[model samples]
Target: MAQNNENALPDITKSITLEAPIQKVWETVSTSEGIAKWFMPNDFQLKEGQEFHLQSPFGPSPCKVLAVQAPTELSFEWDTEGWVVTFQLEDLGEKTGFTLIHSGWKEPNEVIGKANEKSSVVRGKMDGGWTGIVNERLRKAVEELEHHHHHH
Candidate 1:
């Protein structure tokens, strides 16, 4: 099967099939401290242009909230690099599918084809790091929350 007409660009997109329901997953991500448990610590709010910073190396790198759509989507324009990290949720009855898209990749005079080597290397870290945060930290945290739910 041949590929369709190419219009896609390089983005660090990752997804995992989660056992938790959509609401639980959203609750984990959309809150301030809930995200802190998995990703970076922040006083993060859901509205756009909310000013904050991640505890970055040598800098409290400023970040701005980009978009929020309740139990469905949450996006951020983060760090000094200004990339957009979006968490997109899909409801699957009692199960949920979560997708993380790190977009806004651009190279000078060359916006076509794959990402350049430097960007690729940078992309590699984000991909690897998100794997830990999304698949490991976030996943386990949600499960633990569900366990708490069993008590309720």
Candidate 2:
């Protein structure tokens, strides 16, 4: 589990259990091309020490790849300043259990206030966003893949 410091702001966590197998879920979560299908298009590389940017409406959000353990885990720093996002995958027979943790938020302060929202509000939005993305967009993407493979 991803933990935060005692003084740090609360973390955002979300999860989804996909009907696809572990390998398929792994590809969807860990590969840049796979991510583009569900999330925003990115140049992410699943390699430690790699730098990439996620194309956002505001602009490119810089990220640094922190760790990778093949189909099981991947961790990265968002904008090199924000919290760390980690994805953990578990094999569950024919399905895959995916957990995401956005930890290490800074305490509510001027920095967090600049966005016209408090840390708690931002965390709430993040929580909802991740859940929607994983259960809706990513789930649809994997389902399509599963369907394609099954048909072939």
Top candidate on lDDT is 2
Runs with alpha carbons beyond 4 Å of true place in candidate 1: 1-10, 38-40, 49-61, 105-118, 145-152
- Evaluated against the true structure, the overall lDDT of model 2 is 0.64
lDDT of 1: 0.63
> On residues 26-140, what C-alpha lDDT tens digit does candidate 2 reach at each position?
8887778665553457887778767544432255456667778878998877653355678889889888888877775334342343443444455555566677766766676
- For candidate 2, the TM-score is 0.70
Our model 2 lands, by Cα RMSD against the true structure, at 7.2
| Model 1 TM-score (2 dp) | 0.67
RMSD of each: 7.9, 7.2
- Give the Cα error of residue 4 in candidate 2, in Å: 14
What lDDT tens digits, residue by residue, belong to model 1 across residues 1-152? Answer: 12212222246788986788888788777877666663356787778557544433245455577678878999876654445678989889777898888775223212223334344444455567777668755676667732332110
